[PDB]
Copies of this chain bind each other. A is one copy, B any other.
Amino acid sequence: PQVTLWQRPLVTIKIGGQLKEALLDTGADDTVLEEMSLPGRWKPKMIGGIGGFIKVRQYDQILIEICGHKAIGTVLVGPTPVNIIGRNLLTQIGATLNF
C-alpha cells in the first residue's frame, strides 16, 4: 500500500504466534521489538539510539509476517518503547521511500 506520513506508519505483524503493531522505520537499520516470548537461542547485543544504549537479545532467522508479507531475519528483543521494523526487513518486503 502507499503510506503517507501524516500519521505514524503502523502495521500489524504476526511473530511467534502473537499479533503486534509495529512502526515502519526507515531510520532503524535493524528490527527491534519489545520484550516477548520467542523460543530458542539468542545473543546479547547492545544498540544505541537517541538517549543512549540498550541491551537487546539478538534472535536470528525469525519469521515475521508484516502486513500480508512474510519475511525471515534477525530480530532484537529488548526494552524499546515501540516496536520498530527497520531496514533489514523493509528491503525484503520491498518497501521504498518516495518523494
Q: Give me the interface of A with B, judged by CB distance under 8 Å.
A: 1-6, 8-9, 23-29, 32, 47-54, 67, 69, 80-82, 84, 87, 90-91, 93-99
Contacts and interface: CB of A to CB of B under 8 A. Distances in A.
Copies in the complex: 2
A25 B94 CA distance: 17
A83 to B, nearest CB: 11
A15 to B, nearest CB: 17
B96 A5 contact: yes
A32 to B, nearest CB: 7
Given A5-B90, A87-B8, A97 B51 contact: no
Nearest to A3: B97
Given A26-B9, A27-B27, A28-B27, A3 B53 contact: no
A29 B84 CA distance: 14
B96 A50 contact: no
Contacts of A48: 50-51, 81
